[PDB]
Design a protein around this ligand. Structure first.
Ligand code: HEM
Ligand code: HEM
Ligand code: HEM
Lengths: 677, 455, 678
């Protein structure tokens, strides 16, 4: 059990009497009053201790990535990687290390929607036997800006307008696009966010990246530059925007529930930990500077090496205590890893330590159960708010004769201490500049865009069309077009259409036709359909439900999560039409006989909103899902103008339908249903 | 201009050079580095002062009603209501008092959708010439529970399940309906939340209620029981659920934008302030106990008497500084108003003062611009986190020869002091019970249901 | 071991490599730099995690009682007291309960001196099997004020002036005496603070009091009014002011070191827990209201009944984590005890819960190891800053079908729940007043003063003379005399002399001659002299040291702590004259041969300040200590004009000196050396 060490702080209240927080049994359902209809007494200590604790439940949300969810798991090394790193967790084949991972959006506050369009966080902690190592990554391999000092500018522009605090969890407003166009470095991450990466199907269907070049260091100090990659074993999958919007309202918790359900059902998600490794002398050899976090290294130049695998197989017991409280830091580093001079990374090291003071209101947050390492803490730190330990060593300083030299110094050669890469040097004048090697802001956005499929490119264009059409200031829109045109004249022209503007003339300085693999989502079918969801539209009339029950049983053989829907909760019904929406499902199937709820009176019961069954099938179809109907249910498909000869539409006998749907779920999204310019 | 008093703390950055928080002009777009492709230096004080402030931007959201929006405005009294209250803001025809109002949902966190189905907050501050008076109300006249000690139970049951933090901003889950059925008092507010009140068209289309019975007290100490009502001049309007759900994704900011736009376009919304006034001897006259916040008083027994009108005509300049930071309290009471032994109200008085300590991390939150009264603060309180003033009086205690008796005691007869209703008495045993008069949990939910149209 | 439960949070660093707070071995003696003489790098995560922790070590001090120290121990019940209380910790003979006690002054900030003149705190936690029960008491049985709402007034007036923050740890300034005279309720506690209780010899030599009348309640709801008393087994003992002042500079840690030493030496201090028990119908029977905390109940009307004994026998391992962080509350009450309508107590209940939010910056302070009960916490509280547990019950509300009704309600009849005294009632109008039964502010101050010995009375007068002479405002001084006159014309007159004023004429309204037992310090000898300290003045020249060593060995036989003092740290020498002062010792003895440092060449060593040995002996005598000299050392006594015939002065052979000093130490202070008016 990955949560094993947490058991000692778990509290079971089953079969117990209520107590105060200082012990003593109580009742706490009535205030103490002076007389039958009297005022409450100040001496009611029970009332105040209970309400005081309630009154103080909330802590500040994270300044960014406030909306997220996590789980525990295990990382397993595939090898002894000592030839590239001294890092203990990678030091032996089959070696296992507990992890916790939190996934998130970026802009939105605590209770914003999972299916907002946004960059996504993917933060992993390895509780190694040599200290906590965090890879604090995102589901997109490049970041908006080149120097950490600019982070508040970026974040301020994307988050809601400070006068009215609108809009929530959205880049679709003037200030954000003002920043994107005023700080062109932002254009690369912007294109990624406007792609499927901005609206993933689930946390499980995302890759993750460290973004920065880091260093792996061996015992003797030999270093390699490294990029961290998480490769999902579930496959990348993304929604379409018009779908993600309805899902934001129908189920704000879509991703956190998806993760929770997969773990609880025994379908633990996995990712392989992979790296690209680069010689120090080639830091600037691939057409860009590897210290620049707005660029990625095409895998054609440096293929992925697979170090191991992570599986997330245990949900938290208390969300607040575990998921809300956990404090990630890129500064959480261990022997065998080092930083690079990436000016974005450099500032994060400061920011994440400091911000913990805000969120946890004290310096002892590393003592919280979820933050504690498993490898022992021995130093001369004392006191601070909430000090949870009692230190035995009264000579809390070094050097010292009186403590016999303990705790002792550890370094490269003694006691497996952390050490900075020995080869690293400083050279030149102290400066507040950025290297001219960081200057190209357009080539890689173009590379990315080139490497998408035609419809996938259309999705990016339509995302930009949607977003920029929200910008009220005309010049900002023009500014955006000018910047887009430096990436691609075609992109700029197609966006300009929506905005009713003329796109500038071609500016070919950065234009090119290069492509790179591995950045697309829709070019590849899923490796497994386990956990995917099928909504079966049925009815309480006739024999439909029995047939739906049969269909469900068969589909479940394939590891599918099946929901039978009907007018009301009859035997075998999982959900009512009233509670149902296409957004909850990856496929929609109409069970034989349910065609009766697709027209006339049958479609207008007081039990659900008018047209609900038709709307679900229509949404399912329009959003590119595998849709189907069994036997006479083909009439439901006919009623919404759909034909069984279309890709991802299935009709006929039950066996046929089950096979078709299961195939279509691998394809996942049927892109023939989306018009291209 | 209702925001007039806030002008002195407004900061204009037009045409100005960038500075640190301690002054001195700077640039802050590049970290200081040790060489061209070098590491960032610890001595970059500019970087650290800028990021430290960013790193520390957030404060805890409100434990309830975390999602909401507000506006400034003016309340105008329609008369000299001295025959019913000593309250200064109601003391003269056409007398004007600045207000701030925050509207909200209840369950959801700060970024949740405006169009979730929920009870809605409707909280008003009158910045009176005799201190801040808050009516911290909702858009529904009755509350779920009868004793404040049960508030954490209600709220826990309604908020997200504590294992997975699902679902957001919704009563549609096991724990909430377990509580509602286990604690039947909750059925009345439940029926209201399941009606159009649960999904209003806009804040501007809501009525408001103080819920509890309070007291209006004249100079001589005579009291009347009172229910506070806000009547929307825009009329009540509600969405349908299937619509509210879609809107929650398409525009989570529907209500806050609606209010912002109405004010910006010069369509300032208004509400009349109205009271129901009941003699003390009729507290238990109408088939229920007026101390019981799960019941409302049918207008057939006591018509709504209009006292004045409030119009919200100024948006905030900075949402965080004004709307996020404002700290309402039912304990914000002034001479001419008093509490009653409503056991729900009673506990609120404690919780709202206490909770400010969490949200503002210090005792001096009333010194924040949006929290300051207009009428002057003179007492022997000193120090505390973030103390923003410098007190002249070195004899910060009473009684005292050395300070000549100032600041001076004020009471019913001298200095327009607050005073508890003189005739209130206590009698009976100290108890952890509720009155048998509170026992009917079903009659009013039925009354409410009966009084709606078929659809 | 009273500290047993705390072992699981103890951290041993011996034999270990240094680490960060998130694990991983490190070195942390050099900042990471860009080049040999280069700037420090922001990427130095080691430097930052180390300095951030340091930077944030401090937490607000207690708003009152900031200066203090504590220790762990065991309370043992002498009986099954179920006939008077349902309280489990008192439910059986020989039943043992861990305790922690913190003692303190009141006004001074952290770092202020132990021997300031002040009221002292005496706060005891019983970690009972039915929750934490605190008796948050003082070493004086009455308080300054009658209603909690006036606490900030009292405290502001006593603490430093708010313009310059002067004076530290003292009531000797205008605002304090302005308050005492403007708010006459204060006069009673003032008299106690002006007596020996204001300057105790140590924490171990104090009695303790709950002050408030509380209630004891039996299982069947029957109640008794109660006063809590702690009676010191070491005996009460006080310093003299002129000594306390020097000691405040010479060793600000006098009391905290004393407690620590007593425990480490295996001389754990003990106190008996005693109660006064009176029926509800006695609340107003004794000429005052038992709800009034400015009055004590004379033992002549209700004798002390001993319930058990607590012994403090374990020092803390980390002062901050244990002593600094512990959070006492009078609202920490358990089944079998209840509050009374004491309006001072009533408001404390609010204040102590609220103040923890300031000091601990979050709502989960009861989770700190020192605050945790031993008896189990099961409720629906969740979250909050620094939540240290992981709750298993996902249905964190009541009532509930889903949690099967757990955690369950406990009351008087089910589950040993707390319950308010069943008979308590409220009658009358809501009011912002005080009972007229609280109106007499002078009778008990007079009763107290009456009950002290003549010299003891003089100390009170001299303390007032000292304090009031610091008041710059003429009218405040007159106001003080007018109020004093209402207690005793004689007191007022004797004080007035020092202030160069004319005391008002007699105002006999409250005058009386009654006396009561148990309030005097100097009217009784000490029950034991164990742990008391003897400074032996010696010299490295001649044979003095060998004799001093012999003297030391004999004295230590009687449980005394002996310090041999000489010019330098020779073999056998515990302390240098440079480092020594009479304030450190309960007795001063010149070893034979040491007269050589009292005059002549031996007295002019550059190794100590001029006159140092003579001063120690002079201070010891004038401060009323037993003083002695062995053999020829009597010349030392002669050098300072002191004569052998005097009480508490001893000379002759070693055997005789030891005998007399040991008997003198029981008397402790020789009051014949202090002049009395007239
Ligand atoms: C490669 C670029 C970046 C990546 C991949 C990234 C990723 C993340 C992630 C995944 C989290 C959420 C961790 C969690 O789930 O709790 C987070 C939080 C945070 N990030 Fe970043 N971020 C980047 C850039 C920055 C920069 C430049 C700054 C400021 C200099 C910054 C400051 C913060 C802060 C203050 C938090 C809140 C941490 C907390 O409250 O625990 N980030 N970031
Ligand atoms: C008639 C019953 C109630 C009504 C009408 C009501 C109304 C409100 C409103 C409108 C707000 C948000 C104020 C704002 O916009 O900032 C609020 C917040 C709050 N309520 Fe209540 N509430 C009720 C019951 C209770 C009870 C019984 C408690 C606890 C005993 C309570 C505790 C709180 C707390 C701690 C806040 C957050 C205040 C802050 O952080 O500034 N409420 N309530
Ligand atoms: C009989 C009257 C009183 C007694 C015997 C008393 C005793 C004490 C003692 C012994 C302490 C120190 C506890 C420790 O060692 O940590 C203390 C602290 C304190 N007292 Fe009192 N006091 C009295 C009156 C009051 C009143 C009337 C108030 C306010 C209404 C008050 C408020 C406080 C506060 C806020 C602290 C700080 C507690 C902490 O920070 O943990 N006291 N008192």
């Amino acid at each position: 059990d990955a949560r094993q060490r947490l058991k000692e702080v778990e509290v079971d209240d089953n079969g117990q009497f209520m107590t105060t927080d200082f012990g003593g049994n109580i009742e706490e359902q009535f205030s103490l009053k002076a007389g039958g209809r009297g005022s409450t007494l100040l001496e009611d200590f029970i009332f105040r201790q209970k309400l005081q604790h309630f009154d103080h439940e909330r802590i500040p949300e994270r300044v960014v990535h406030a909306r997220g969810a996590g789980a525990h798991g295990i990382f397993t090394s595939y090898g002894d990687w000592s030839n590239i790193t001294a890092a203990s967790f990678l030091g032996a084949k089959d070696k296992q290390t507990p992890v916790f991972v939190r996934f998130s959006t970026v802009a939105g506050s605590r209770g914003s929607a999972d299916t907002a369009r946004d960059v996504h966080g993917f933060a992993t902690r390895f509780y190694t036997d040599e200290g906590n190592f965090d890879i604090v990554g995102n589901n997109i391999p490049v970041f908006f800006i080149q120097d950490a000092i600019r982070f508040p500018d970026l974040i301020h522009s994307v988050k809601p307008s400070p006068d009215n605090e609108v809009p929530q969890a959205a880049t679709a407003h003037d200030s954000a696009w003002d920043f994107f166009s005023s700080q062109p470095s932002a254009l690369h991450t912007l294109f990624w966010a406007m792609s499927g990466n901005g609206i993933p199907r689930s946390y499980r269907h995302m890759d993750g990246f460290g973004i920065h070049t880091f260093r792996l260091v061996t015992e003797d100090g030999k270093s390699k530059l490294v990029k961290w990659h998480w490769k999902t074993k579930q496959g990348k999958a993304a929604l379409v925007w018009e779908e993600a919007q309805v899902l934001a309202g129908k189920n704000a918790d879509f991703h956190r529930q998806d993760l929770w359900d997969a773990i609880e059902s025994g379908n633990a998600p996995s990712w392989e930990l992979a790296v690209q490794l680069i010689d120090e002398d080639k830091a600037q050899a691939y057409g860009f500077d590897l210290l620049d976090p707005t660029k990625f290294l095409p895998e054609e130049f440096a293929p992925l090496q697979v170090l191991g695998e992570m599986t997330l197989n245990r949900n938290p017991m208390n969300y607040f205590a575990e998921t809300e409280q956990i404090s990630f830091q890129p500064g959480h580093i261990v022997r065998g890893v080092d930083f690079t001079e990436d000016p974005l990374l450099q500032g994060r090291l400061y920011s994440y330590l400091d911000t913990q003071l805000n969120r946890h209101r004290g310096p002892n947050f590393e003592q919280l159960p979820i933050n504690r390492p498993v490898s022992g803490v021995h130093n001369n730190h004392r006191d601070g708010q909430g000090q949870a330990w009692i230190h035995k060593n009264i000579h809390h300083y070094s050097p010292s004769y009186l403590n016999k030299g303990y705790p002792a110094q550890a370094n490269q050669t003694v006691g497996r201490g952390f050490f900075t890469t020995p080869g690293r040097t400083a050279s030149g004048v102290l400066n507040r500049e950025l290297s001219a090697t960081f200057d190209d802001h357009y080539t890689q956005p173009r590379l990315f865009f080139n490497s998408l499929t035609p419809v996938e490119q259309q999705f990016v264009i339509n995302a930009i069309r949607f977003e920029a059409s929200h910008v009220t200031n005309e010049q900002v829109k023009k500014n955006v077009l000018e910047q887009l045109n430096k990436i691609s004249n075609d992109v700029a022209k197609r966006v300009a259409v929506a905005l009713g503007l003329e796109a500038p003339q071609p500016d070919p300085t950065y234009y090119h036709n290069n492509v790179t693999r591995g950045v697309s989502i829709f070019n590849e079918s899923l490796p497994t359909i386990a956990t995917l969801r099928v909504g079966v539209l049925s009815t309480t009339k006739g024999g439909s439900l029995d047939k739906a029950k049969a269909l469900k049983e068969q589909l479940e053989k394939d590891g599918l999560k099946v929901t039978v829907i009907a007018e009301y909760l009859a035997s075998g019904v999982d959900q009512t039409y009233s509670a149902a929406d296409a957004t909850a499902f990856d496929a929609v199937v109409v069970a034989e006989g349910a065609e009766r709820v697709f027209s006339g009176k049958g479609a207008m019961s007081p039990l659900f909103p008018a047209g609900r069954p038709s709307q679900i099938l229509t949404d399912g179809y329009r959003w590119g899902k595998p849709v189907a109907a069994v036997g006479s249910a083909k009439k439901a498909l006919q009623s919404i103008g759909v034909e069984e000869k279309e890709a991802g539409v299935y009709a006929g006998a039950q066996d046929e339908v089950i096979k078709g749907v299961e195939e279509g779920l691998k394809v996942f999204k049927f892109l023939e249903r989306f018009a291209v310019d």
